[PDB]
Amino acid sequence: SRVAKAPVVVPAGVDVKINGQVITIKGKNGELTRTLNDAVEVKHADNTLTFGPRDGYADGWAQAGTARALLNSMVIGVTEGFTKKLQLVGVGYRAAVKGNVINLSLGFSHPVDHQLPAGITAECPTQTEIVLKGADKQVIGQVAADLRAYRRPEPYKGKGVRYADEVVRTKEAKKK
Amino acid sequence: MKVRASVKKLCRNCKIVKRDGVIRVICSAEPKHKQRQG
């Protein structure tokens, strides 16, 4: 609720364009960085964002923190470009990029054909380490989340794709 | 994990979060705590 009162004051040369309830962030080095308030109304003002209750609703605080968070996230996306450093632990898996394709093994006899969305790009320094590039904070973690789905950091020996919030707590083996 | 009913705090990092019309125990300490009905 502290963060539904926050005015943001968006940086210089970021264009934040309001269709009312769709709010759209444009600037240099990227496209389609956006946010939807659906329960709550966000007026942009001159740059001091004001958050309040919408017509046809009863619901409160719920989308108004999200809208502040999500807009600021997208303004840094186009402003600095969000964090990029991905990595994985475990032998013989990889994440080696060649173009639009992420090359990996899952022990499968079919090609896995894990591919990157057309709206993002990647490169690799080394065959298990990935650097992703774009200006959207959502997308980069969404393609990471599907690449982890069944290779999520295990609670035992930690093996998995590692990026952001992580559940691994380590265990020692059973007594002999 | 057991399906259960009545939602309780299994540990200090069980956040307890309402997904659809059932309250789920969702934890970021241990995956052991993912309780299916509340």
Place this chain on the structure above:
Amino acid sequence: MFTINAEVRKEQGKGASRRLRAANKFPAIIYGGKEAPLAIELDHDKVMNMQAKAEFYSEVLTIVVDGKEIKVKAQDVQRHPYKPKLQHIDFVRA
């Protein structure tokens, strides 16, 4: 601690008292001393959130009715059939 108000009885009996609880009021009484029993009406939810802190019972009450103040401490309690909510409270003068 608490500074509350009361009305002197327009209406008395069981028939009377059901129409107070219908309107979220209930009755009460201040007895003792050399002087007459002071029958009063209170509001229910005016006191219900006061007596949620223990200071309702540890400290004396400012109860003003026809602008008269004599000071009061709580006595034995009358309760609704299925709620700990107050159907009627007894009081003694302090």
Place this chain on the structure above:
Amino acid sequence: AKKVQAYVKLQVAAGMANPSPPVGPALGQQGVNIMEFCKAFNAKTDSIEKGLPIPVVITVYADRSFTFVTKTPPAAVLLKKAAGIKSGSGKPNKDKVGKISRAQLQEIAQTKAADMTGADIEAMTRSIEGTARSMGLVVED
């Protein structure tokens, strides 16, 4: 998880940290190679006696970088020695297996001084008081 613990504990004699069991598991678990630590440790132990427990407090950083501090022999070792006891009672305070004077305690205190944080030499004595108390030595005024 960054997997950090600050002020990681060891108490071991100076010439026996080559095997892992005298050191226990925790150093491995914060990533300090046991062999490498034993070599780094040996350069300042040449004035120390074989078999005598040396206190060691380690900080480990996130990137598995480590720094390590080496300390003068325990208060617990000096008090057992001065009392003529091999071992404690295993019951503190209610079981007496000997006694120790305030005047012996003050010499124990001055040998620990450079590690002690106390602003008075007495302040130091009061910290080592409870070491005598755990081992079943009564602290006489």
Place this chain on the structure above:
Amino acid sequence: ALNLQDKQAIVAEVSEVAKGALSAVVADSRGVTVDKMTELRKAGREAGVYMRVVRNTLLRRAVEGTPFECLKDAFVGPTLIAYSMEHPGAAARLFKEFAKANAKFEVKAAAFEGELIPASQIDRLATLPTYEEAIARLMATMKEASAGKLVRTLAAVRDAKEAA
């Protein structure tokens, strides 16, 4: 208001000494680290310099309840305060002991004999012999300029007439 006294007592306890200090130093760390704190407790008891790490919440209620000189514009944000009411030079040396284990751009301000000192000026200032060593160096500056310099010059002219 608070329900307990702890926060209100500690504002008065710092304010007394912090108005009083002949030098004080207002610094940034946001997690001061206990290894450093303990060595700075250790050498502070040698110099009789005192040190506290202290919230901007405590200090801002301090600026409201009590008038301050030369330190209050620096109380915003994360703050350590090392201070002496005695030996002014040692208080300013304490930041050079902390700068041996830490970043030196982190001072926001100082006071010295009631002067406001900005974050950039103190780094020269702070070398700072203590008040007894200073007074004796000033006293030598005037005793020397009065009669010693006169004679230096009366010699230098006799020397030019001396011919080789």
Place this chain on the structure above:
RNA sequence: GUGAAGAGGGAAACAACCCAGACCGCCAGCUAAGGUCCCAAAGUCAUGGUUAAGUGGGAAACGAUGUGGGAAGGCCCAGACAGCCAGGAUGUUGGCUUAGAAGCAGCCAUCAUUUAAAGAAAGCGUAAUAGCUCACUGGUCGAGUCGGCCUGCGCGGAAGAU
């Protein structure tokens, strides 16, 4: 009371329910219980409060960090409450126990130090040292926040012969 020994209106209907007590005839009006978007006759009623389950309009034990309002009150821009981040120290890996027993396997001490400050530790977790949260300390942080209680609404609990 009704049916038994009575017609009509309402209930998805019936021989006892709720309203009501058919003399007949009248393309007459009102009222009852019950209703008022379509079946199907009338309110998508005016004002305010709230939920998102077809709860409503299907029932309990039971439970929690589901969600709002309200009044009374502590906290309350002089900085909250809670998390996240960083610090978590000196004796000290105290004594017993042991591979080491180290706040968190067991048992006893339950202390003392420079300190604005860090329990010889509240709870978690492969037996465990671990990894982690935790007050307390300091960041991020500049407005609501929490305990009690009244109250609107929720939940999962609530799987079967067509």
Place this chain on the structure above:
RNA sequence: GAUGUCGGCUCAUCACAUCCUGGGGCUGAAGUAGGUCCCAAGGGUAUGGCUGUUCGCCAUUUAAAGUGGUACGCGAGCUGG
């Protein structure tokens, strides 16, 4: 003044609280495998004996030998034992 019973075959049908493949959590689960475990009606789901007979005992198949109702399915079909 007739709503008439048991077990089996033939032929069935409907409920899923699933015998099994399948997708997924936890694990005192390294992997495997098992313990724990949720979604799911779509489909396949054995035979000879003795007894009136389901169940039994015994020999036997297969990866396997399910759960519940039906005038306790089906005598204007059968064995009517």
